[PDB]
Amino acid sequence: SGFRKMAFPSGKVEGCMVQVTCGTTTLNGLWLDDVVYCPRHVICTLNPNYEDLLIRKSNHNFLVQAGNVQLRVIGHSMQNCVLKLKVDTANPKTPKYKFVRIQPGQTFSVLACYNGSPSGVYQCAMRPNFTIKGSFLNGSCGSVGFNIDYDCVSFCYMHHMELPTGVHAGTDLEGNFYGPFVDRQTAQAAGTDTTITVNVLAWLYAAVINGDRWFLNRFTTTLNDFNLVAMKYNYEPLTQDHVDILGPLSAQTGIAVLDMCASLKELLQNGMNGRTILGSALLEDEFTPFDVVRQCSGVTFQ
Amino acid sequence: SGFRKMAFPSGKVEGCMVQVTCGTTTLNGLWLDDVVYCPRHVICTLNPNYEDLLIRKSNHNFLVQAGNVQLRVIGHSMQNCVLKLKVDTANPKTPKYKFVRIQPGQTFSVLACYNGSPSGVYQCAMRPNFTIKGSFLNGSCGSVGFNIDYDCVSFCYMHHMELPTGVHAGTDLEGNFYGPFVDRQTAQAAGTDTTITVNVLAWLYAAVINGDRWFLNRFTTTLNDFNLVAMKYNYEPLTQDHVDILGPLSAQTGIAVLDMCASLKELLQNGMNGRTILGSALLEDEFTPFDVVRQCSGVTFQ
Ligand SMILES: *CCC(=O)N(CCC(N)=O)NC(=O)[C@H](CC1CCCCC1)NC(=O)[C@@H](NC(=O)OCc1ccccc1)[C@@H](C)OC(C)(C)C
Ligand SMILES: *CCC(=O)N(CCC(N)=O)NC(=O)[C@H](CC1CCCCC1)NC(=O)[C@@H](NC(=O)OCc1ccccc1)[C@@H](C)OC(C)(C)C
């Protein structure tokens, strides 16, 4: 028992981090086979034209350090907002991997890195407004976010920038930003966020699995009537697809999904009355149904 | 900016996990050089006498799997509550490492493991009552907890057992339990816990570093008067040593330690009034002063 903000084991990703330096700019890169992926604003020189900035660069302008070893850059290309530096050596620690673009509400592990060296690992969710509430300092750009499926690393996030509210914006590993953000230092802001309803419900099921039941009640609700209360509290709408995903958790605990919705409704309307759930005094929304199953059941990775 | 429950990168420890099987019992072991460390109750056959159970075992009774490779056991010895299995092969992925016994209030990363395969990583603190609030299922015993200092892994915890309240008990890597617990399935219970005061104060300094100030006030307090209020709310006493440790954080923010104590006092006496600090509606006590400095300043590991 117990329930924790669990990250994936990070070793497979640690073996891929490197330092990219060009001009006076240094940041992190991701070394998979003979390519290094990094944010394109590593390149020299408000509102830049990156195609024009890149044609002016030479391969030897790029200093790539992998540990105590310099890698030689033999080609480069820009894809959206990431640079791909082709190097003369394939990374021998390259795991099995995929690049995936996730939906809002999905969670992932972040390996925070400075100068190509890993600093720490933590669990994040992609918010409905396409920011992440990360922990990132200057020099962290190029750190990646990932999931691990059995033996395969699915990279889903590369960090680029921090917004005025202290939240973070970045891209998938093919360089497409999540949300409306652009990689310029022009004024931009997050957009209003909402609570990830299907995740809050998954976390309530985790609480039941772990012996917490105090928040349950005898009522039920319709999907429609639930969504009417959800709207009022800035929760995103629950769909029939969300209901179906919560299926396994509902069957394991014997609590109908709409019955758990009735419990969430009463918690929204009444507060928690000075009581906690899984060690929290807030309704937690950064665990997916998959996260709960994986941790309350014990899936590993080879 | 941002502040997260950050674990250490786990790769150096992942390379040391193995599976130990003897009889019908399988659990995790830690492979450093040519020794495998695991909990001694791996051995065959309420109230066991382990010296007597161990003399009856043979080296070939122990099946140690490291990936797809069986390691051969060529000796064994018991040290307190851990077994040490000498194997014929030194682990080539052995990091630089130390074994350390930590004090209550100290934090560490836990690499949860099943059948020798890592499942997830999370951050823990040793509670004042010498339990940890982990996330552990059947088969997790032998998973380890650790800190990383630059290049060196300091192992401080090996998991053994779960207590009726859902918290966890275990040993240092030389087999000495934290707290009064014994490795038998006789009735045992945690003992009343207290809040780690110096950690709550460190976390309030983290909130200030990240732009939260709403909980500060104009008052001050004496150490003695503070401790009188702390007692009433089940907080452990703050000592002059705690005050000195909070030194660097106090100087970086310009808030005197006893001034921050006055703020904590007012938060204890008044509640948080429906407001949050660093995304929490509770006073968080599982970040040390070191944790805060490391994350708000960006220390890495090579
Ligand atoms: C790559 C360097 C890096 O580590 N990093 C991550 C910073 C953190 N803490 O996560 N990224 C940056 O520092 C980027 C670098 C620029 C280079 C040019 C191309 C875009 C990225 N800058 C910022 O993160 C920057 N944000 C920003 O400019 O947002 C747009 C904006 C501008 C002006 C007013 C309002 C919004 C940060 C450093 O600026 C603050 C918002 C002031 C923190
Ligand atoms: C090594 C197997 C393992 O994974 N593991 C971790 C369990 C979790 N979830 O963390 N450890 C155990 O399962 C141990 C195995 C025994 C073998 C004999 C020597 C001691 C350890 N058992 C327990 O964790 C057990 N606790 C326990 O017996 O506490 C003492 C006690 C007994 C009776 C009444 C009250 C306290 C668990 C499995 O028992 C529960 C407390 C019922 C959960």
Within a domain: A58: yes
Residues A209 and A179 in one domain: no
Contact B15, A10 (CB under 8 A): no
Instruction: Judge contact between A159 and A136, C-beta under 8 A.
Output: yes
Helix, strand and coil percent figures for chain B, each rounded to 5: 25, 30, 45
Among candidates A9, A117, A124 on the partner chain, residue whose Cβ is nearest the Cβ of B121: A9
Would you call B183 exposed, middle or buried from its count of C-beta atoms within 10 A (0-12, 13-18, 19+)?
buried
**Residue B237, both tokens:** 């006493």
B47 in any annotated domain: yes
Ligand 1: residue whose CA is nearest its atom 28: A185
Residue A229 CB partners (closer than 8 Å, separation 6+)? A265, A268, A269
Domain end among A168, A193, A218:
A193
Main-chain phi, psi angles of B162, to 5 degrees: -110, 140
CA angle B195, B201, B204 (to 5 degrees): 120
Distance between CA A54 and CA A40 in Å, rounded? 9
- Give residue for tokens 């100068």: A115
One domain for residues A188 and A267: no
Q: How close, in Å, is residue B54 to chain A by CA atoms?
A: 30
**E strands in chain B:** 17-22, 25-32, 35-39, 63-66, 69-71, 73-79, 82-87, 96-99, 107-114, 117-125, 144-149, 152-162, 168-171
User: A205: which residues sit within 8 A by CB, 6+ positions away?
Assistant: A246, A249, A250, A252, A253, A255, A260, A289, A292
Extract the tokens encoding A189: 């802001």
CA-based nearest residue to A277, from A256, A260, A254, A300: A260
Q: 3-state DSSP call for residue A159?
A: strand
**Phi and psi angles of residue B236, each rounded to the nearest 5 degrees, phi first:** -75, 160
Could you tell me the maximum CA-CA distance found in chain A, to the nearest angstrom? 69
Residues of B within 8 A of A134 (CB-CB) are 2, 4
**What are the structure tokens assigned to A37, written together?**
């992926």
Domain limits for position B84: 15-95
Instruction: Determine which residue's CA is closest to atom 22 belonging to ligand 2.
Output: B161
Q: Is B28 in the pocket of ligand 2 (CB under 6 A)?
A: no
B285 in the same domain as B199: yes
CA distance B261 to B221: 7
Task: Quote the distance between the C-alpha of residue B216 and its chain's center.
Answer: 30
Burial class (CB in 10 A: 0-12, 13-18, 19+), A69: exposed
CB A18 within 8 A of CB A116: yes
Ligand 1 atom nearest the C-alpha of A160 is 11
- Domain total for chain B? 3
- For residue A24 the two structure tokens come to 């006076």
Q: Answer left, alpha or beta for residue B126, where phi above 0 means left and psi between -120 and 50 means alpha.
A: beta
With b for 16 or more beta-carbon neighbours within 10 A and e for fewer, the A23-54 pattern comes to: eeebbbbbbbebbbbbbbbbbeeeebebeeeb
- For residue A162, give the nearest of B1, B115, B302 by CB distance: B1
Place of tokens 């209360």: A229
- Per the CB < 8 A criterion, the answer to whether A132 and A107 are in contact is no
Work out whether strand B96-99 and strand B152-162 pair parallel, antiparallel, or are unpaired.
Answer: parallel
Could you confirm whether A113 is annotated as catalytic?
no
d(CA A289, CA A188): 32
Residue appearing with tokens 């917490």: A212
Treating both helix axes as pointing N-terminal to C-terminal, what angle do B289-297 and B197-209 enclose, rounded to 10 degrees?
20
- Contact state of B122 with A5 under an 8 Å Cβ cutoff: yes
CB of A46 sitting under 6 A from ligand 1 = no
Candidates A135, A140, A281; nearest CB to B282: A281
What's this structure's resolution in Å? 1.9
DSSP character for B207?
Answer: H
- For residues B208 and B144, give the distance between their C-alpha atoms in angstroms, rounded to a whole number: 33
Q: Which of left, alpha, beta for B240 (phi over 0: left; psi -120 to 50: alpha)?
A: alpha
Q: What is the rounded CA–CA span in Å between residue A78 and residue A84?
A: 6
- Looking up tokens 């064994």 gives B76
CA distance A94 to A115: 19
> Do residue B104 and residue B181 come from a single domain?
yes
Closest partner CB to B11 (pick from A14, A114, A295): A14
Neighbouring-strand partners of residue A75: A86
* CA of residue B120 to ligand 1 center, whole Å: 31
B231 and B204: one domain?
A: yes
Residue with tokens 């809002």: A104
φ/ψ (deg, to 5) at B145? -115, 150
Q: Are residues B6 and B74 in the same domain?
A: no
Last residue of a domain, one of A95, A115, A144: A95
A23 shares its domain with A135: no
**Please, what is the Cα angle at B300 between B295 and B302, to 5 degrees?**
160
Check which CATH number belongs to the domain holding B23 and give it: 2.40.10.10
Residue after which a domain boundary falls, among B38, B66, B95: B95
Residue A251: how many CB atoms within 10 A of its CB?
A: 11
d(CA A57, CA A61): 7
Q: Give CA separation, B203 vs B122, B170, B245, B286, in Å.
A: 18, 27, 13, 9
Chain A residues near residue B5 by CB distance under 8 angstroms: 5, 122
CA gap B248, B251 in Å, rounded:
5
Q: From the alpha carbon of B140, which atom of ligand 2 is closest? A: 4
**Dist. CA A139–CA A157, nearest whole Å:** 16
- Supply A266's token pair: 């009463």
Name the token pair of A300.
Answer: 């590993």
Distance CA A171, CA B120 (A): 25
B9 and A8 within 8 Å at the Cβ level: the answer is no
Count how many residues are written for chain B. Answer: 302
Domain shared by A100 and A143, yes or no: yes
Residue B270 lies in a domain: yes
Q: Which residues of B touch A298 (CB under 8 A)?
A: 114, 119, 137-140
Nearest to A197 by CA among A164, A241, A251: A241
In angstroms, rounded to a whole number, what is the distance separating the alpha carbons of residues B263 and B78?
Answer: 50
Distance B162 CA to ligand 2 centre (A): 5
Domain match, A1 and A117 both: yes
8 Å CB contact of B281 and A281: yes
Distance between CA atoms of B87 and B64, rounded to whole angstroms? 9
Residue B56 forms part of a structural domain: yes
Dist CA A261 CA A201 (whole Å):
7
Cβ-defined contact of A115 to B300 (cutoff 8 Å): yes
Please confirm, yes or no, whether A141 is among the known catalytic residues: yes
Query: What is the Cα–Cα distance from A46 to A186, expressed in whole angstroms?
Result: 6
B302, part of any domain: no
| Short-list A174, A81, A183, A170, CA closest to A130 | A170
If asked whether residues A40 and A81 sit together in one domain, one would say yes
**Experiment type:** X-ray
CA of A263: how far to CAs of A108, A207, A270, B84, B132, in Å? 27, 13, 11, 50, 30
Whether B7 sits inside 8 A of A301 (CB atoms) is no
Residues A228 and A222 sit within 8 Å (Cβ to Cβ): no
What DSSP character marks residue B33? T
- Based on the fold, state whether residues A1 and A106 are members of the same structural domain: yes
User: Quick one: which H or E segment has residue A98?
Assistant: strand A96-99
Q: For residue A111, give the nearest of A179, A4, A15 by alpha carbon.
A: A15
What is the per-residue burial (b if ≥16 Cβ within 10 Å, else e) of A108-135?
Answer: bbbbbbbbbbbbbbbbbbbbbbbbbbbb
Residues of A in contact with B208 (CB under 8 A): none
What's at A207, amino acid-wise?
A
Do residue B300 and residue A134 have CB atoms under 8 angstroms apart? Answer: no
Q: How far is A54 from chain B (nearest CA, A)?
A: 30
Return the closest-CA partner of residue A136 out of A169, A174, A103: A169
In whole angstroms, give the CA distance from residue A31 to residue A38.
Answer: 9
**Residue A48 and residue A88: Cα distance in Å, rounded?**
29
CATH of the domain at A219: 1.10.1840.10
Torsion of CA B203, B208, B213, B215, to 10 degrees: 20
Backbone angles phi, psi at A87, to 5 degrees: -115, 165
Enumerate residues 6+ apart whose C-beta is below 8 A from B57: B22, B43, B44, B76
Decide if A48 is inside a domain: yes
Please compute, for residue A253, the number of CA atoms within 13 A of its CA located in the half-sphere on the CB side. 27
Q: How far apart are CA B76 and CA B74, in angstroms?
A: 7
Q: In terms of domains, do B242 and B198 share one? A: yes
Token pair recorded at residue B131 = 């339990």
Closest residue in chain A to residue B296, using alpha carbons only = A137
